[PDB]
Design a protein around this nucleic acid. Sequence first.
RNA 1: AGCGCCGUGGCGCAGUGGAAGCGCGCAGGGCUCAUAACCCUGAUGUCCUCGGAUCGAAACCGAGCGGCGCUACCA
RNA 2: AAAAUC
Lengths: 86, 105, 267, 470
Amino acid sequence: SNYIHIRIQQRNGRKTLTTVQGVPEEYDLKRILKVLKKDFACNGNIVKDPEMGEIIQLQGDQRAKVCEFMISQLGLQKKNIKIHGF
Amino acid sequence: PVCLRDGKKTIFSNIQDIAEKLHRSPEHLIQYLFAELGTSGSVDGKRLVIKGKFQSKQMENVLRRYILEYVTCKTCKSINTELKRENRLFFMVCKSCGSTRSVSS
Amino acid sequence: TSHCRFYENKYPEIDDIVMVNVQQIAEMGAYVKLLEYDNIEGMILLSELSRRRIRSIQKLIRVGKNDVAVVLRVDKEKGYIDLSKRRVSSEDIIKCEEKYQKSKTVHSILRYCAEKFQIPLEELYKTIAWPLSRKFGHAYEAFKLSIIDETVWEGIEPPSKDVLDELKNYISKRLTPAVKIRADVEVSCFSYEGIDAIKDALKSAEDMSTEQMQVKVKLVAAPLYVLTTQALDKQKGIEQLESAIEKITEVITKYGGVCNITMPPKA
Amino acid sequence: GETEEEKRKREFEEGGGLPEQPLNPDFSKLNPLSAEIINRQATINIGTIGHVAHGKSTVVRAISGVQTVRFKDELERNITIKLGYANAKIYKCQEPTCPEPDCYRSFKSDKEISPKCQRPGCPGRYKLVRHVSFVDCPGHDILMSTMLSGAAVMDAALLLIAGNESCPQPQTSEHLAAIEIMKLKHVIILQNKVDLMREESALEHQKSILKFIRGTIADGAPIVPISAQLKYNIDAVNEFIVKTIPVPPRDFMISPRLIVIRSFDVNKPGAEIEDLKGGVAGGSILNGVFKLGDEIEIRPGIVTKDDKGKIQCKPIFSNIVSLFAEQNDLKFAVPGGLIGVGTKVDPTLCRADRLVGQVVGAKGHLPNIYTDIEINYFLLRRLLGVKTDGQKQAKVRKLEPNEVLMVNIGSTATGARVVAVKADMARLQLTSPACTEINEKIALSRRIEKHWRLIGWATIKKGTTLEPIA
RNA sequence: AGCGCCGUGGCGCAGUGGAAGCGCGCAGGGCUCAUAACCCUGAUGUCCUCGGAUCGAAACCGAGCGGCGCUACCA
RNA sequence: AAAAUC
Ligand SMILES: Nc1nc2c(ncn2[C@@H]2O[C@H](COP(=O)(O)OP(=O)(O)CP(=O)(O)O)[C@@H](O)[C@H]2O)c(=O)[nH]1
Ligand SMILES: [Mg+2]
Ligand SMILES: [Zn+2]
């Protein structure tokens, strides 16, 4: 249940977008986007996708860094969250 | 695991042997794979072909995860379990031990 | 033969909206047949064809398919009709397709009648369809009211009574709409005797069943008792279920328990 | 070339089947070992205890063969809330030639009086030494009310320990100690994981377990290596059950009583309600026989809170329609077992966990409900069921006034408020009613780490009663 | 166990009563220097199985199957 | 208008 994983979508000119799918509601999302923006210097979106869920889209190609934020903010598991190569 | 990369296409011409040696039905394995990965691929007659850029490491790790959470017993060292449906859910049952443990995700 | 139109007149009026089957486009637009008026070819030119500029001259217009068009001009002298695709509102397209399917359904019914009776469809529409579309404004509403009231066939001369019998049989087979009304009630008993109370309350509930309205109070769980009823008119089932509520509450006020409702009678 | 059904039917008809109990036999000559009792009703309730994820239902299925109905689509997998009931029949081989360890055999309760010996080459017929009821108590650290209700129901015990895991499992010790709290001492030690262990490792595990059970009250606890999976050493378990565990004293000279632990609503859906059955309360009968057709009352019953916050308790009167003691309805009942008393009680009283741990009395007796209860309580030195990574396992403190404590009075699970605390006695106010019949051995659990943890034992010495309103 | 939803051509929605729909894909092409965007072209089905009124049904019903949803483990 | 790469 409620598995967590991150994906990378490429673009023109090597530019990349990162998506974490599934976020616990224990901590709210705007309060988390605020500190995502500073620590990442990348634009972010709390987008709604049907049958998928709320997604915090972020710019760039960063996986260990969103994970490093996750380990400190709410995540205490580091086992359910999956990293995708792509 | 043998992963054939053909341009945009990712081929597994060996998934039949994976299903046979792990004593798992092929369609259940495909369901698990596409619940893990976000793709919808086809099967040719014996081989699982998908359209994407997927590495061999991902295939190896999903096989290991399937082994640890589905194939081998989580309380004993045994593969002798197989797939059944006890009210409507998948309820795994073993043959060497017969223990009632079930994982459906 | 299947040639007659659905509406009254032969040539379209002005500023009316219909739905057209596309057949061919050459250089000025699509001069295509009509499927709501009398069969005639009208021209839909390019700047009257796509809300979007004209980038996909093959996509939005499909040779052999039907899309909504609007009458701009009608030359009621020789043969010419002007039609446009852009000048249809986003909401209006829904009513246009509603009217088109309406026309197609009535046309298919009368076409079955003509094919079985070998009468030209022109006579079927003249003797029947247009008087009903004059009395009620439409022939489909008239079939619907014929289902519930035969009197719509009074005052009109049929081509033959067997045609009337076959068409009434066909509309009864096709245009038939027994609304399923379900309520559910929670027995919240804590008292001494509740099972015989349920037994006799449901016995009384099944007793009031009429030959036309039948009620079988079924069980899905201990508290949840479901009342399923068929209502030929949608107003009798609610009264049946209210009477049932009275019966169960009266039975349970004396034995000691309590019975509560979750869903009252709703279709 | 006989089919399996034909062979089973031939063995059933050869062995005599299941003879119907006499409607009204002379009860002054009727011991729990009589054929009319032994073949068609349990006399000893034996229960299995163990830590989480050990296979508590699997061992009983191995012994008996009847499933506990691990229900609810979420309790299918992790843990059950309601207990697991099971019936098995102990049959000994009458021929002396076959080995004594293999002479015994536990079969299902559908078997006949005299089944043939399945050992290859043995023509002897099995004799039913006893039929035993099985109670499975869930061992999760939040659900302990059911385990203490079962312990109040219990008569014999079977403790389970895993091999490859750590020797000092807190939950097994908690189950054990709770059993010795409830005046129960017939405890048999079972090691389940021997198949995944080596020759030496099981020896150190048994040494550690032997050192573990040294200071507790129970001393003579036999140890059995079993396999819920390979299904071996079952006859040894049956032999130990029959030998080590005799019948606790129970006869027909005491007034009838009932302790309902489960609620069961007979509401088979889809069929017309013109054909229904009675609402069934599943309860243990610790004393007093019941016969087909009786007038009984659930003493706590209706619990209402009026416009002033006061509590009103109306006993639930009911006529007994059936007594599902075993697969076929019985004419009477035998103390020391679990029986489903199916009365005319409305099935919603039995739908959910409502008739959970309540006390029921036959007409002619008035068990007294109490609102404030005087209690004599003794406590243990340290908390149990908690894992401490090498620092002074938490010590049980002393009670304080005006606090909620889960006071499991036999089967009744109540949240009591302590009005006063003395050196050995305390006064408890119950927001949920409880009726005191004779002694009703109590267990106590305190909220120290979120969930409850057992503390000690208690006995009722006085109380403030409430008069039931008919 | 009971009552609600569904049955692709790879995926979804649509018509359900003239007999194979569209978009999403996928493949190729064109646009161009060149990637997206955009513009063309296809090749896949007793639209789950079995019966029935019906010129006719994949569509209307039903006698069964598979997977979802609620009641709720229904002695 | 929307214009992207380099
Ligand atoms: N190795 C081994 N595993 C077993 C055995 N019995 C059961 N298991 C496995 O261990 C787990 C425990 O079985 P289960 O019956 O679900 O546990 P339980 O004892 O009912 C749980 P609780 O103690 O909380 O009531 C299951 O996943 C099962 O596969 C056994 O004898 N050996
Ligand atoms: Mg259990
Ligand atoms: Zn196993």
